Scaffold this active site. Structure first.
Site, PDB file in Angstrom:
ATOM      1  N   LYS A 107     -48.765  -3.843  22.931  1.00  0.00           N
ATOM      2  CA  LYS A 107     -47.560  -3.108  23.281  1.00  0.00           C
ATOM      3  C   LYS A 107     -46.625  -3.891  24.213  1.00  0.00           C
ATOM      4  O   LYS A 107     -45.407  -3.726  24.166  1.00  0.00           O
ATOM      5  CB  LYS A 107     -47.941  -1.801  23.991  1.00  0.00           C
ATOM      6  CG  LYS A 107     -48.644  -0.800  23.093  1.00  0.00           C
ATOM      7  CD  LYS A 107     -48.745   0.588  23.786  1.00  0.00           C
ATOM      8  CE  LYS A 107     -49.243   1.686  22.866  1.00  0.00           C
ATOM      9  NZ  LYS A 107     -50.566   1.408  22.237  1.00  0.00           N
ATOM     10  N   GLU A 162     -41.916   7.536  26.449  1.00  0.00           N
ATOM     11  CA  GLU A 162     -42.934   8.526  26.141  1.00  0.00           C
ATOM     12  C   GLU A 162     -44.283   7.809  26.155  1.00  0.00           C
ATOM     13  O   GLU A 162     -44.380   6.623  25.824  1.00  0.00           O
ATOM     14  CB  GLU A 162     -42.677   9.174  24.765  1.00  0.00           C
ATOM     15  CG  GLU A 162     -43.216   8.386  23.553  1.00  0.00           C
ATOM     16  CD  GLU A 162     -42.522   7.093  23.174  1.00  0.00           C
ATOM     17  OE1 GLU A 162     -41.385   6.885  23.632  1.00  0.00           O
ATOM     18  OE2 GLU A 162     -43.132   6.294  22.438  1.00  0.00           O
ATOM     19  N   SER A 185     -55.892  -5.337  18.404  1.00  0.00           N
ATOM     20  CA  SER A 185     -54.674  -4.880  19.066  1.00  0.00           C
ATOM     21  C   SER A 185     -54.849  -4.679  20.580  1.00  0.00           C
ATOM     22  O   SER A 185     -53.884  -4.774  21.337  1.00  0.00           O
ATOM     23  CB  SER A 185     -54.122  -3.652  18.368  1.00  0.00           C
ATOM     24  OG  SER A 185     -55.103  -2.608  18.308  1.00  0.00           O
TER      25      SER A 185
HETATM   26  C1  LIG Z   1     -50.888   1.858  21.080  1.00  0.00           C
HETATM   27  C2  LIG Z   1     -52.010   1.161  20.458  1.00  0.00           C
HETATM   28  C3  LIG Z   1     -52.279   1.219  19.070  1.00  0.00           C
HETATM   29  C4  LIG Z   1     -51.568   2.132  18.108  1.00  0.00           C
HETATM   30  O1  LIG Z   1     -50.118   2.045  18.166  1.00  0.00           O
HETATM   31  P1  LIG Z   1     -49.438   1.193  16.986  1.00  0.00           P
HETATM   32  O2  LIG Z   1     -47.972   1.414  17.253  1.00  0.00           O
HETATM   33  O3  LIG Z   1     -49.862   1.745  15.670  1.00  0.00           O
HETATM   34  O4  LIG Z   1     -49.826  -0.249  17.097  1.00  0.00           O
HETATM   35  C5  LIG Z   1     -53.282   0.437  18.585  1.00  0.00           C
HETATM   36  N1  LIG Z   1     -54.044  -0.363  19.356  1.00  0.00           N
HETATM   37  C6  LIG Z   1     -53.830  -0.445  20.659  1.00  0.00           C
HETATM   38  C7  LIG Z   1     -54.755  -1.272  21.494  1.00  0.00           C
HETATM   39  C8  LIG Z   1     -52.806   0.303  21.255  1.00  0.00           C
HETATM   40  O5  LIG Z   1     -52.624   0.173  22.590  1.00  0.00           O
END
Ligand SMILES: *Cc1c(COP(=O)(O)O)cnc(C)c1O
Ligand SMILES: O=P(O)(O)OCCNS(=O)(=O)c1ccc(OC(F)(F)F)cc1
Ligand SMILES: [Cl-]
Ligand SMILES: [Cl-]
Ligand SMILES: [Cl-]
Ligand SMILES: [Cl-]
Ligand SMILES: [Cl-]
Ligand SMILES: [Cl-]
Ligand SMILES: [Cl-]
Ligand SMILES: [Cl-]
Ligand SMILES: [Cs+]
Ligand SMILES: [Cs+]
Ligand SMILES: [Cs+]
Ligand SMILES: [Cs+]
Ligand SMILES: [Cs+]
Ligand SMILES: [Cs+]
EC number: 4.2.1.20
Lengths: 395, 267
Positions: free
Chosen positions: A86, A108, A376
């Site tokens: 993010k 948000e 992610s």
């Molecule tokens: C916020 C988040 C997601 C899901 O949000 P996306 O917009 O679909 O990427 C996935 N993995 C992590 C570690 C997150 O912080």
């Protein structure tokens, strides 16, 4: 009138009150200009490198795949400053806010990672940050709320509707509908009204660009498939974007299956919801039969956005990308597997992507396949959740 | 039908403004809401704006957020709202009835079918709060096919192109927004005579000023600025909220309020 197409096929649009259209047009113009501005690009690259720590590693996971013909790499967004992907796009949007002459940020958040990412970018770049968060999320995400406050952000609980993420999304838009002249709305995923799905993709596309260069360097080719979890769609579109035109590369998005698709307790609108109009866009979403917006259930709080970005719905419709689901139990096994065999604690969000890759391997262990999972985020935040599950099931 | 056209022509003959209250259908329950609405009419409402409870009313401030929540607590569904609307029309033949919708409720079972149901029950207009002019085409087309006026929002900052769009596309009335932000009696908004004059030049539907209207003086001021009338929502809903425990007192205070607001509109 817009500079860019607000739709991906039938999906997307600008479904906001008329009062907010000038804010969207302003943001779009500022984005288009910034993308052509080498000084903007240089400043963004500088923050990504020297503050956030890009490029992130691409790790070959050998223990997990031993004895199969799968080669698995993890793109290490878990190593980015803040512990999740993010951070990339909040730095870009913070720079757009400054380009427009704004000194205030609205955001948000659900599970809290976007709030923290917004707060950190705002602290770094001298912006006054206010964050809306459903009151139920506030109560359950005390660590993230404290992080946001430490970083100087104002956290405002939202008590309306279901007191969760969708309600915070509403409240952010209500605020912006009165404050857009001085405040930027820093939306947290590749969804919402144009131009946000486009901006967020472009400010996350370094994930896939790096992955492509790293895989070519190590393997001398493109991956057979890149796999990413899908909450609202930002990390997955950031991984996918640079490969869209590489027709041989599979693009696999993994939605949360929760307790099981058949239970109805899931978060998989793209494949198991119904197209509707909400949060500024036409997209698949979780809704009642008569059109009230519902909640996305997952063990992973970060996969609870009750819709999905319009570009994903479009890529699915044309068969460019494939979307699957992974249940809570599958995600948990993948989490345990990565900790034990690779010494990496993955976010439970990311564990959905890993679980699907492990299934691809295990189902067909003599299939030659070169896979990349977008890791992610890191899963330090999830250890209490996991501890509590393992103990309750008596492990 | 031509309910707004007939109303404005009659009001014009009396050099009179329209007073138009908003309430949420089914707040605080179906039966009391029906009685509330009959009270608003008996006390002098010229037209109604009626909200269908929606999970995500993102153009509404807390007062009306809470109205939606009370209706949900009473189990109110869009289907029950349409039942209500049929009964309201069966009692009251000429009063214009406008709905305040959010897009998902209109799109849910098909846009055409939504406007067909509006026509069947005798609704006169639909304002979809999260559909800007840029997205309006399927909504306004379906409205007109079903003899429903599509209501367009004119922000207080509207440029010439937007005014021409709202003037051309709209019917029934043009919604003249007092200010930016969301519904609420706390924030008083609009300095709109310039827009009012341009809308008339472009043969727009007559203007009703809305957002922040909570006092007689504001109704008078809207008509003096050249608007055809004024809409008041939060101020009306606040009386519901304040008097939940005494349905009799609620109706008495609604009557008093609407009477005063309507008096302000008279020549
Ligand atoms: C916020 C988040 C997601 C899901 O949000 P996306 O917009 O679909 O990427 C996935 N993995 C992590 C570690 C997150 O912080
Ligand atoms: O008196 P207030 O301040 O509560 O205002 C009441 C207005 N109720 S309404 O149905 O006209 C109405 C009209 C437009 C709205 O949003 C939009 F402009 F975006 F379309 C929302 C409600
Ligand atoms: Cl275009
Ligand atoms: Cl289109
Ligand atoms: Cl090499
Ligand atoms: Cl392939
Ligand atoms: Cl612990
Ligand atoms: Cl009419
Ligand atoms: Cl009547
Ligand atoms: Cl319906
Ligand atoms: Cs590095
Ligand atoms: Cs292997
Ligand atoms: Cs999703
Ligand atoms: Cs539909
Ligand atoms: Cs007209
Ligand atoms: Cs008067």
């Amino acid at each position: 009138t817009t500079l860019l197409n607000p739709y991906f096929g039938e999906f997307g649009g600008m479904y906001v009150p008329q009062i907010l259209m000038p804010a969207l047009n302003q943001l779009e113009e500022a984005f288009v200009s910034a993308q052509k501005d080498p000084e903007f690009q240089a400043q963004f690259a500088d923050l990504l490198k020297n503050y956030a720590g890009r490029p992130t590693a691409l790790t070959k996971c050998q223990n997990i795949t031993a004895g199969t013909r799968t080669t698995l790499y993890l793109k290490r967004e878990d190593l980015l400053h803040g512990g999740a992907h993010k951070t990339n796009q909040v730095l870009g949007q913070a720079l757009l806010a400054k380009r427009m002459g704004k000194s205030e940020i609205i955001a948000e958040t659900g599970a809290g990672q976007h709030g923290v990412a917004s707060a950190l970018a705002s602290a770094l770049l001298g912006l006054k940050c206010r964050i809306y968060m459903g009151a139920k999320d506030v109560e359950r995400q005390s660590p993230n709320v404290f992080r946001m406050r430490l970083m100087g952000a104002e956290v405002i609980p939202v008590h309306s509707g279901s007191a969760t993420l969708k309600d915070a999304c509403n409240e952010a838009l209500r605020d912006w509908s009165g404050s857009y002249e001085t405040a930027h709305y820093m939306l947290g995923t590749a969804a919402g009204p144009h131009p946000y799905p486009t901006i967020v993709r472009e400010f996350q596309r370094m994930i896939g660009e790096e992955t492509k260069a790293q895989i070519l360097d190590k393997e001398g080719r493109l991956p057979d498939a890149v796999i990413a979890c899908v909450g609202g769609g930002s990390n997955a579109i950031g991984m996918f974007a640079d490969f869209i035109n590489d027709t041989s590369v599979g693009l696999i998005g993994v939605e949360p299956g929760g307790h099981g698709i058949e239970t109805g307790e899931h978060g998989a609108p793209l494949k198991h919801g119904r197209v509707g109009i909400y949060f500024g866009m036409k997209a698949p979403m979780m809704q009642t039969a008569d059109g009230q917006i519902e909640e996305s259930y997952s063990i992973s709080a970060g996969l609870d956005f009750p819709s999905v970005g319009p570009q994903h719905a479009y890529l699915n419709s044309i068969g460019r990308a494939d979307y699957v689901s992974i249940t809570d139990d599958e995600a948990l096994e993948a989490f345990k597997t990565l900790c034990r065999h690779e010494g990496i604690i993955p976010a439970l969000e990311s564990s959905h992507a890993l679980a699907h890759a492990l299934k691809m391997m295990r189902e067909q262990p003599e299939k030659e396949q070169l896979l990349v999972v977008n890791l992610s985020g890191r899963g330090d935040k999830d250890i209490f959740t996991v501890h509590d599950i393992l103990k309750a099931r008596g492990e | 039908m031509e309910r707004y056209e007939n109303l404005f022509a009659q009001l014009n003959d009396r050099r009179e403004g329209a007073f138009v209250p908003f309430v949420t259908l089914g707040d605080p329950g179906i039966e009391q809401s029906l009685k509330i609405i009959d009270t608003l009419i008996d006390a002098g409402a010229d037209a109604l704006e009626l909200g269908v409870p929606f999970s995500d009313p993102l153009a509404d401030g807390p007062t009306i957020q809470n109205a939606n929540l009370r209706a949900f607590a009473a189990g109110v569904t869009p289907a029950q709202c349409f039942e209500m609307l049929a009964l309201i029309r069966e009692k009251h033949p000429t009063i214009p009835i406008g709905l305040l919708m959010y897009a998902n409720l209109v799109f849910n079972n098909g846009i055409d079918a939504f406007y067909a149901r509006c026509e069947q029950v005798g609704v006169d207009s639909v304002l979809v709060a999260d559909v800007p002019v840029e997205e309006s085409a399927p909504f306004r087309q379906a409205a007109l096919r079903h003899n429903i006026a599509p209501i367009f929002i004119c922000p207080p900052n509207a440029d010439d192109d937007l005014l021409r769009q709202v003037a051309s596309y709209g019917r029934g009335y043009t919604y003249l927004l007092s200010r930016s932000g969301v519904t609420g009696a706390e924030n008083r908004g609009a300095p709109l005579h310039h827009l009012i004059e341009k809308l008339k030049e472009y043969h727009a539907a007559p203007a009703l000023q809305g957002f922040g209207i909570s006092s007689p003086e504001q109704v008078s001021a809207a008509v003096r600025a050249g608007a055809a009338g004024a809409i008041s929502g939060s101020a009306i809903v606040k009386i519901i909220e304040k008097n939940l425990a005494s349905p009799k007192q609620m109706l008495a205070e609604l009557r008093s309020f609407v009477s005063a607001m309507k008096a302000a509109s008279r020549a």
